[PDB]
């Protein structure tokens, strides 16, 4: 309320030797683990780590077409193996009925 | 009999892939999310016979193994940069490259890393994200009017 | 089975976002209104296996968790200043900064 | 300070709202696909035995 | 050389852009057909055994 | 089966072109901007037989 406008705090960030090695939790949290690395605390832009972008929010990287097509792929492969098991059953019932 | 086992194997494998895909689609729009993908690898193959070098007027012969089933080797997370949108709240930064925010439920003994940034003040002074945790960093010293980043 | 649960999860989540958005649009023009927005966060992930450090001539290995579902963490109200219009009634002030009646 | 003889309208921007009406809808549609394929795999399972 | 007191706008021509919005879309549609017919042949295969 | 893979391939390719185009249109008017464009090339072909 005085004329002055002091900076009142500062935000640290960190980086790991291996992203995606680190484990997930519920929430948007991640967690350090083996085959990941140590936290390596530093400042906002000097360690080779990127700058903040203020007043803006970062959306998910999920592309959607790639996802839907996989919904097709998975389904058809599933169907096929489902056929394998069925014919494999019918041969068995032919075996057991062979003796009568 | 044998084909039945390999067949059910592929079946549960595809099930596992479907679950991960279902998650990825399930949380589009959630901030800071990074999608994963399933990976497959063949099961050990029975070898009924061994390959052989040419001998007494005969040629060589190929190994005679069957090969049975398929299974999931690993998932992998993927960390490409996401798209950004602006908001009207000043206190919601999004990093533009690499590195994560730290948070902790305590004094900082157990840090957790995130790329989401819905930071906001409480009635009390602590600078908090969604649901609880207080973001790590450091405060100014009024005697000097200066931040002290080194510690 | 699993994907069905995660799938219905995302579905009700988007439902909840739609309701808030529906309110915001529903009361444009009402004086003094401040719009809100929905926020999402991932559900806890099952971890089928643990990550491991390199050992006997092998490299390390990534953790093998699945990850299931999405849910609403919180709404947030937003308090930016609105546009003003004049009226002909003298007794209808509008504050020009912060603070409430 | 007070501003006399004037009335303060809502802060809702409208374009931001309409675009979200699109976003929500499309995401909704997608999850709606997930559930459907998940059902069809189940009916293939139950019909597998016959 | 510098040109003082003036500001240099983007080189994007717009007609060239919009037409490409058409091209991309139609090619996308076509490949989308390819995948579909490719699926239907598969379901004919799996239903062939019944 | 084969045609399915080639078909999804072209699909994501056109997706990638759409993103770049979307950026170019998205920032008209920004000063000093220079637009980009996507480029395509064929994948390696299986050769069932020799000439």
Residue numbers in the entry:
A (entry chain A): 752 to 851
B (entry chain A): 1 to 151
C (entry chain A): 1 to 101
D (entry chain A), E (entry chain A): 802 to 851
F (entry chain A): 1 to 51
What did the paper state?
We solved the structure of the hook of a fliK null mutant strain derived from C. jejuni strain 81116 (NCTC 11828) by electron cryo-microscopy, using single-particle averaging methods with image segment classification followed by systematic symmetry exploration. The final combined reconstruction yielded a map at 3.5 Å resolution that was used to build the model of FlgE. The structure of the hook protein of C. jejuni shows five distinct domains: D0, D1, D2, D3 and D4. The hook of C. jejuni is composed of 11 protofilaments that run along its length. The diameter of the hook is 280 Å, which is substantially wider than the hook of S. enterica that is 180 Å wide. In the hook, this central channel is made by the C-terminal α-helices from different protofilaments. These α-helices are closely packed and make the channel look like a continuous and smooth hollow structure with a diameter of 16 Å. The L-shaped stretch (L-stretch) [Gly32-Gln81] in domain D0 of FlgE is the segment of the hook structure that has the most contacts between the different FlgE molecules making the hook. The L-stretch is engulfed in a pocket surrounded by six molecules of FlgE that belong to four different protofilaments. However, the presence of domains D3 and D4 increase the number of interactions between the molecules of FlgE of C. jejuni, both within and between protofilaments.
